[PDB]
Amino acid sequence: PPGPPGPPGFRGPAGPNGIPGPPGPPGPPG
């Protein structure tokens, strides 16, 4: 008869870093 299933796969990799945030606020007067 066929053998048993192989063992489980490793956990997947981390997801990508988040995308950058939006632009910052306007600078101070000057």
Binding site for a second copy (CB under 8 A): 1-30
CB of 13 to a second copy, least distance (A): 5
What is the Cα–Cα distance from 17 to 11, expressed in whole angstroms? Answer: 18
Residues, the chain? 30
CB of 28 to a second copy, least distance (A): 5
Nearest approach, Cβ of residue 27 and a second copy (Å): 3
